[PDB]
Amino acid sequence: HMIIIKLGGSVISFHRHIVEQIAEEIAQFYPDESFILVHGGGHPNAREYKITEGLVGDVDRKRIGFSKTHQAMLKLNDLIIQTFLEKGLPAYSVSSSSIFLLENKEVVYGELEILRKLLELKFIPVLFGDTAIALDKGIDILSGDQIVSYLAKMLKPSKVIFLMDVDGIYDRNPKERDAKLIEELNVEEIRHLLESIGNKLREALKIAKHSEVYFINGKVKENLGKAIRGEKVGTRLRKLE
Amino acid sequence: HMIIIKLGGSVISDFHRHIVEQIAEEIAQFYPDESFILVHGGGSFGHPNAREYKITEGLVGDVDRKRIGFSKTHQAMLKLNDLIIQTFLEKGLPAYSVSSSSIFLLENKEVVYGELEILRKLLELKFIPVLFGDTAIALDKGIDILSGDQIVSYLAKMLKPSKVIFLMDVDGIYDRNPKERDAKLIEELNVEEIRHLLESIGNKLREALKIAKHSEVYFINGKVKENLGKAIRGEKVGTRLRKLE
Ligand SMILES: Nc1ncnc2c1ncn2[C@@H]1O[C@H](COP(=O)(O)OP(=O)(O)O)[C@@H](O)[C@H]1O
Ligand SMILES: Nc1ncnc2c1ncn2[C@@H]1O[C@H](COP(=O)(O)OP(=O)(O)O)[C@@H](O)[C@H]1O
Ligand SMILES: O=P(O)(O)OCC=C1CCCC1
Ligand SMILES: O=P(O)(O)OCC=C1CCCC1
């Protein structure tokens, strides 16, 4: 009984009111429910220093920007952590680039014993999309979707909840005209959509092999509780069989 | 051919940006031909929160308040870590933060579980990882305070550095409390003297005994710049504890 919740980069950006709403919803299940939290950037230094290119060209500048981008990520992570703390929840920050190693944007080495111990002692670990050491490229950007995929394979949570700007995975483009919400997502529908973001839809296809997946609107407070309890909300991709 | 520098808690803070710039300049005199790990203690940041929430008592009594204070102490340590790293970055050195509580587990104040591959890759790619004394999960009492001395001890037995350099408020180890008007600095430390001093701080001397099995140890004054380079070059400075045999 453990639930991973991924906060998109756009729902938290700082949007303290929505973080307070997520914390109040999580408080309805703590501590009779283990929770892991992952959030994203809200990004400037990563593009400015070309982290995804790797350790090539001006390597000294890339190492400085690698650290600067990590320090910025820690500052935003602190904003989220403090908000959770004044709401009574023991959120504890875990540095992603301290426990993960990348190859081809994917985690190929991980340390998970501290996360396990944090959950066992009724803590709420909070990771973030981060800069990360890459075996193939020296340095790379580890996205939140990759952390969630690796955690899903290893810790096998009961479900993974994506908080997005829209109500879920839509038929056409969400901000279009005649777009319908896919309340029940199956794998063939996912492959239907990937031919015509697709990155997290691919990660969702991987995660579904291990856990139930929800795509919900993180701006509506009650959606998080509806997804945690299993009620109808947004888009739901059941565990594969 | 790797050096572990420990930055005493009352050296870097009680924040002294000037001496941190001094340590950065000294280190930049040897980077990148030499690889460094830095461990800094809680200055005026981590202690006022740890003793306020009594982290060393473990997960006992008001466990909910201790969990909050556990987190608040880690966040303050991360703020101090950011000041030290930003200072190192502006000096052109690629310092990178490693969260101690993300990779270590404690029991009886000692690390009994650790992850060191990310540290290894950081050193391999010419980064300077910066760890800190931190709150930590303890297998016996739930939560505890992981001292930078114990971090360096675990890193010494594991990575076997060429030397370990403690930056302190004093010139090194003395015959007694340096506050006494008659107190002399020990230039060459040995196990007999360490046991002599311990029978009457002490934690740093016990860890130094364990560390000396794998690395040569230096105790120097961290507020005098040229002292660090002297210890890195193996010159005569402060107190030296040679590798055991
Ligand atoms: N068919 C679709 N269904 C839902 N959202 C879509 C679709 N096509 C494009 N999008 C948009 O793609 C974006 C992906 O969000 P993204 O920035 O990847 O989240 P994160 O911050 O977690 O990386 C969403 O904001 C959404 O508006
Ligand atoms: N024989 C001795 N040699 C050196 N320092 C001593 C001795 N006896 C007592 N001390 C004192 O113990 C202190 C050790 O500080 P310490 O607790 O190691 O700092 P931190 O915990 O921040 O690393 C020194 O400031 C020094 O004044
Ligand atoms: O969770 P996301 O948004 O997929 O990845 C996180 C993105 C960044 C960019 C700089 C540091 C972290
Ligand atoms: O690193 P030091 O000074 O040896 O040990 C003390 C460390 C901390 C970190 C949070 C509270 C106290």
Set out the domains of chain A in order of their start, with CATH numbers. 2-39+76-90+114-130+143-237 (3.40.1160.10)
**Residues from chain A contacting residue B97 (CB–CB below 8 Å):** 67, 70-71, 74, 95
**End-to-end CA gap in chain B:** 19
Which conformational region is residue B134 in: left (phi greater than 0), alpha (psi within -120 to 50 degrees), or beta? Answer: beta
**In contact, B80 and B41? CB cutoff 8 Å:** no
Query: What is the number of residues in chain B?
Result: 245
**Residues from chain B contacting residue A93 (CB–CB below 8 Å):** 71, 74-75, 78, 99
* Strand ranges across the sheet with B239-241: B95-97, B128-132, B35-40, B2-7, B163-168, B216-221, B239-241, B188-189
**Residues from chain B contacting residue A64 (CB–CB below 8 Å):** 89, 92, 94
The pairing of strands A106-110 and A100-103 is: antiparallel
d(CA B223, CA B18): 9
Pick A85's closest partner by Cβ from B71, B82, B126: B71
Residue of A nearest to B123 (CA): A133
d(CA A67, CA B95): 7
The pairing of strands B35-40 and B128-132 is: parallel
Q: CA of B151 to nearest chain A CA: how many angstroms apart?
A: 15
Name the H helices within B125-225: 148-159, 191-198, 202-211
Q: φ and ψ at B188, to 5 degrees?
A: -125, 110
Q: Is A200 annotated as a binding residue?
A: yes
Q: φ and ψ at A15, to 5 degrees?
A: -110, 80
Q: φ and ψ at A51, to 5 degrees?
A: -65, -40
Cα A12 to ligand 1 centre (Å): 15
Among candidate residues A124, A127, A122, A123, the one with its CA nearest the CA of residue A111: A127
Cα A75 to ligand 4 centre (Å): 21
Resolution of this entry, Å: 2.5
**End-to-end CA gap in chain A:** 19
d(CA B103, CA A156): 21
* Strand ranges across the sheet with A91-93: A91-93, A124-128, A34-39, A2-7, A159-164, A212-217, A235-237
- Torsion sign, CA atoms B170, B48, A117, A103: negative
Among candidate residues A68, A122, A121, A124, the one with its CA nearest the CA of residue A94: A124
Which of A30, A36, A59, A63 best probes binding to B when mutated, by most B CB atoms within 10 angstroms? Answer: A63
Greatest C-alpha distance within chain B: 51
Q: Is B204 annotated as a binding residue?
A: yes
Is the CB of residue B185 less than 8 Å away from at least one CB of chain A?
A: no
> With the CA atoms of A67, B132, A101 and B138 taken in that order, what torsion angle do they form, in degrees rounded to the nearest 10?
-150
Pocket flag, ligand 2, residue B10 (CB < 6 Å)? yes
d(CA B40, CA B35): 17
d(CA A135, CA B23): 31
**In contact, A136 and B152? CB cutoff 8 Å:** no
User: Atom 15 in ligand 1: which residue has the minimum CA distance?
Assistant: A197
Verify whether the Cβ–Cβ distance B101 to A114 is below 8 Å.
yes
Q: Is A178 annotated as a binding residue?
A: no
Q: CA of A139 to nearest chain B CA: how many angstroms apart?
A: 9
- Which residues of B, range 117-176, sit inside 8 Å of A by Cβ? 117-118, 121-122, 125-127, 137, 139, 142-143
Pick B89's closest partner by Cβ from A64, A109, A135: A64
User: Atom 12 in ligand 2: which residue has the minimum CA distance?
Assistant: B201
Verify whether the Cβ–Cβ distance A99 to B115 is below 8 Å.
yes
Distances (CA, A) of A239 to A8, A146, A157, B146, B159: 22, 18, 11, 41, 43
Q: CA of A168 to nearest chain B CA: how many angstroms apart?
A: 33
Distances (CA, A) of A207 to A155, A156, B93: 11, 9, 39
Among candidate residues A126, A202, A200, A212, the one with its CA nearest the CA of residue A164: A200
The SS3 of residue B202 is helix
